Structures are given as C-alpha cells and as structure tokens.
Amino acid sequence: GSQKERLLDELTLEGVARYMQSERCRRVICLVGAGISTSAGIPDFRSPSTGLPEAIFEISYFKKHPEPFFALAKELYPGQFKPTICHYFMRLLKDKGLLLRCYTQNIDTLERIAGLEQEDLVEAHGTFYTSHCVSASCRHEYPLSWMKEKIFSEVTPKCEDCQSLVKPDIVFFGESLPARFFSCMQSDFLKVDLLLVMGTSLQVQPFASLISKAPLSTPRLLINKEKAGQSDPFLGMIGGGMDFDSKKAYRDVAWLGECDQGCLALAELLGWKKELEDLVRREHASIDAQ
C-alpha cells in the first residue's frame, strides 16, 4: 500500500470499535507484553514500582551461573495460573474469527490457558510450558510439572538421560528468537487489518519493530499505562513509529490505563461485554475448582 490513508472515522476507542465492526476489518494481530499479565501477579521488571542488573535474564550469565535464575523463578512462580480479562479478550477475537495471530513477549503460558492454540500464537520470547535438555545430541523434552518440581524442589534441573542442564524453552537476552517468529511475521503483516498492541512499552527488539511491518494503512491501537512506540526524536534523526498526537495522525490510537479496563471498555462498545463477563467468570471458577 505505502499510502497513508485514514480508514478510522476518528482516533478513539469508539473509532476503532466501528472499524472493528466494518466489513473491512477481518484480520487482527495483537502484540502483548508484561502489562497484560500484571493483574495475574506476574511482575514486569521495567515497571518503576514492582520491577527489577539484567544478568539473570542474559544468556552468557545463565551459562556460567544457571542457579540465580532458578532461585528467582521460584520467587516469581505463581500459585495459580489465572489469565486476565485482556487474555480472554484475545480468546474472544479467536472464537469470533478475527484473530490472525497473537505475538507475545511473555513466557507465562497464559495465552494458552485462555485457550489460544499453537496456531494462534507466537511466543516470541519462548515459554515455560516446555523445557529442553541443552545437550545438542539429547534435547529431551520435559513438561512444566517436572520443571516446576525441580524449581520448587530447589534442585537444578538435570536431564534424566544425560545429566546436562535442562533449560526452560524461554529466549534469554542475547539469544536468537525462534525461527517461526520470522516466518509468521513475513506472512502475517501483509494482510493485517488492525494491530492491537497491549501491555508492552515496546522497548525490546526485535519484537518492537513489528509495528513498522504493518502496512501504513492498518489502524494501530495501543492499550497501556503510558504511550509507547513513538519514534525517538534523536534516533529518528538516523520508519513507521507510532503517531497518536501530531497533525499527521491518521491510524494510531492510545488508550491509557489498565489493559483489563481498556479491553473491557472496548468489548463494551462491541457488544461483547456480557460474553466476556461470562467467560472470565466461568474460566476463573473452573480454575478455582482444580
């Protein structure tokens, strides 16, 4: 396309809602991060309050000393896995046939617990759901029960076949992202009709650059405590950054607050509020009843 037309009747949630119910909006891509799992009690470490250098998350420091990470994963391992309204909102996109993909930075598996399938989902920074023996000639797969027993056991996970470290299938800082990230990205962004960016300040690459892969005509909604993805005034000096505010704004909308309240309010414009109220209440209760 490469031509910057305005398909949104206005730059609001209401504008996006009408667009979302137009015949033109059929393929929706969500980009999510830690902001959508904070109300589940998983902290984000770039939040000023309740946030944590980043050696723990770096791969070189993991290799030498794997123990710091595992001792923390324990601290942070949640008692219950209860997806949020923001997640169940993405489940509604799926069921209603709008969800092309959810591209997530989180490793918490909550997208899957809300009922997104592998096909719907790009765990760009991997996940805890499965773990693998790091030994190249082994690569034995272990599930979260096992990995959790080790973590909560406070025993460093060792492969039962070769005794090499068993690492959670998460991508560390310094590591390459999974290959499907790029194969999906190259296909998905050709025919996306709406970009739904939720609970990420977009300060991790290459993830952050996904917004620029969107055609210049795709509307982009941000749901977040603060604005993000605007081009830096100095690095811009050396494309497709967010524009909520300039006079050349035409497709970017910021809804600032909690993702659970934004997704709730967006559902209300769409006439989904009840479904979403039922779903969350029923899935939570189902989880409460394990």
């Binding site: 920074h125 800082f173 310094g174 390459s176 992202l177 991790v204 690459q205 993830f207 952050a208």
Partner: peptide, 6 residues
C-alpha cells in the same frame, strides 16, 4: 537479530 534492550 537477538533479544536485547534498545
């Protein structure tokens, strides 16, 4: 590229 703060 590779996961990194930027």
């Amino acid at each position: 590229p590779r996961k990194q703060l930027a």
